[PDB]
Structures are given as structure tokens and as C-alpha cells.
Amino acid sequence: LDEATLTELKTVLKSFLSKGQILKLEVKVDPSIMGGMIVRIGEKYVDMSAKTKIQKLSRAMR
Amino acid sequence: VQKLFVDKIREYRTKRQTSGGPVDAGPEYQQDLDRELFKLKQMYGKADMNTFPNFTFEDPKFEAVEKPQS
């Protein structure tokens, strides 16, 4: 991605912790996630992706 | 994911444009719905659409008892 959408996520990910610290990060590209991003601050895992096609089993689940 | 909420309704409306049953059946849905239509009649029975019950019953014949008495 570009600079205007990454320097926010390198700063809005600092708004969570708030303990006098200097953050670090890794990036890995995966296309099987079709339309989102997953992130793991420690052991947190806020998932927003194309898993939400499998969550439409409830339409087929009576 | 309300952007996915609109995108599974809008490709449900496309399925509501139907002419003859299946859209991509081919030899698949034509054979399977005919294989299953036999099995609801195969071990069940041979039955028409509107034919009433047509039969006739005969009761037990009342024989007599011969009896010289006194």
C-alpha cells in the first residue's frame, strides 16, 4: 500500500498499547484472504477478511 | 460486512430469473431428479393420480348344522 494508509496503521496501532514504547511490525502477503486484513497485536487476532463467506452457512442452516 | 450483505442478496435475485427449473443442470439435474422420482415410487407402489378404490368383498357363507334330536 501507499504512505497515507500505512502511516496511520503505524500510528493507530500505537494508540492501543500506551505504555511508553516504540513499536515494530511484520508484513506477509497472502491472496487466499480475498478482501481484508488480519492483524495480531500479541495474541489478539482481530479478523476482518473473506472468512465471512463461510459465516453465510446460517442461510443454509435452517 | 454489509458490503457482503448486499452482494449475496443481489446474486440471489439473479437466481429468481428462472425459466425451466435448473440453470446449469445439463445431464446432472435431469438424471438425479429422475433417479429420485423413481425411488419414491419403486419400493412404494404403482399409483395413478385420481383412481378411486375398486374392489369387492365376499363374506363367510353361513352353513347349517344337521341334528336329529330328542
| Resolution of the PDB structure in angstroms | 6.2
**Contact of A38 with A45, CB cutoff 8 Å:** yes
Helix (H) or strand (E) holding A60: none
DSSP string, B1-67: -HHHHHHHHHHHHTTT--SSS-SS-TTHHHHHHHHHHHHHHHTT----SS-----------------
Residues contacting residue A47 through CB under 8 Å, at least 6 positions apart: A36, A38
CB contact under 8 A, A56 and B1: no
* Set of cell numbers at residue B40: 419414491
Q: Tell me which of B1, B7, B9, B15 to substitute to probe the interface with A (most A C-beta atoms closer than 10 Å).
A: B1
User: Residue A50 in contact with residue A36, Cβ under 8 Å?
Assistant: yes
Map residue B10 onto helix, strand or coil: helix
Contact B4 A53 (CB under 8 A): yes
Q: Does A46 touch chain B (CB under 8 A)?
A: no
Length of chain B: 70
Give the count of domains, chain A: 1
Domain membership of residue A16 as a residue range? 1-61
Give CA angle at B54 (B50, B55), nearest 5°.
Answer: 160
Question: In one letter, which amino acid is A51?
Answer: K
Contact status, residue A35 vs residue A50, Cβ threshold 8 Å: yes
Residues whose CB is less than 8 angstroms from the CB of residue A37 and which lie 6 or more positions away in sequence, other chains included: A48, A49
